[PDB]
């Protein structure tokens, strides 16, 4: 019960998922893998939040597993930096991707088209990991990898995987996923944007049939106030984006690990 421009939005952004989003991250590949003064106290705080081990699966039916080091006071906390800022750059790729294909975001001028990308892609990625995450079992299940939370209550301490987990409840749909995902990028207070009237314009668009959408298809009283919940969700990710950031700024200050397009899009210049 949607306007016929509200059906070819939601038809066009499911249609940009759709190629850009290797669900089974079939061409995530030839990827690094752990070997076989006061800053640190904070980086080690900001590390230990998301201990996770890693499993392969390979074609022949082997299985590969790793179970990560505890804290010994030493670098052996970074040895999974190489793989997850691998993981990382293969999630961007198919952001830009999936932006670049959006006739909305195309139809930008180009500096405000890498000022939205900068200050989206960690929230997309955020969410494009929420449809492969198995709550019941607290493991990201990615094709032939999959990465498992290691042993309860006090992991939802941890706001990023708080929020995982509250997003998995909501029980959304694919054209749910990517409205979120639109809405996200389309903010029109991002760092150095420009037509900040035309990007507003267009996500109130995108947020009005996200609502639309909800009461058209989502009748049962399970789902009264959805579109609110996930309106905070949007500004909840947003929060984490912003205060993780920093996290990632001050690893890289003392152990440089960030991918060059993970430089581009963080703003680190090179010298
Ligand atoms: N952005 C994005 C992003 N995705 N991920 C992520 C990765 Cl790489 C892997 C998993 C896995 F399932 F494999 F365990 C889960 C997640 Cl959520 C992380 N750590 C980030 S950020 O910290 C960064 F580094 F800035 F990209």
């Known amino acids: 019960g949607l306007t016929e421009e509200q059906r070819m939005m939601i038809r066009e952004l499911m249609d940009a998922q759709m190629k850009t989003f290797d669900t089974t991250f079939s061409h995530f590949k030839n990827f690094r893998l752990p070997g076989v003064a006061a800053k640190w106290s904070q980086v080690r705080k900001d590390l230990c939040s998301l201990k996770v081990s890693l499993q392969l699966r390979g074609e022949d039916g082997s299985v590969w597993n790793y179970k990560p080091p505890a804290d010994s006071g030493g670098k052996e906390i970074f040895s999974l930096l190489p793989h997850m800022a691998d993981m990382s750059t293969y999630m961007f790729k198919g952001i830009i991707s999936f932006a670049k294909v959006i006739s909305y975001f195309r139809d930008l001028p180009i500096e405000d088209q890498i000022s939205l990308l900068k200050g989206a892609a960690f929230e997309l990625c955020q969410l494009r990991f929420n449809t492969v995450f198995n709550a019941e079992t607290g493991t990201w299940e990615c094709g032939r990898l999959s990465y498992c939370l290691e042993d309860f209550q006090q992991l939802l301490l941890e706001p990023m995987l708080k929020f995982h987990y509250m997003l998995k409840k909501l029980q959304l749909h694919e054209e749910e996923y990517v409205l979120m995902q639109a809405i996200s990028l389309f903010s029109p207070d991002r760092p150095g944007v420009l037509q900040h009237r035309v990007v507003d314009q267009l996500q109130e668009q995108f947020a009005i049939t996200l609502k639309s959408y909800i009461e ?56």
Not at 229 to 251: D, F, G, P, V
């Open 216 to 271: 058209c298809n989502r009748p049962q009283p399970a789902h009264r106030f959805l579109f609110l919940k996930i309106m905070a969700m949007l500004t909840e990710l947003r929060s984490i984006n912003a205060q993780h950031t920093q996290r990632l700024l001050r690893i890289q200050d003392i152990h440089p690990f960030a991918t060059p397009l993970m430089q581009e899009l963080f703003g680190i210049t090179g010298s």
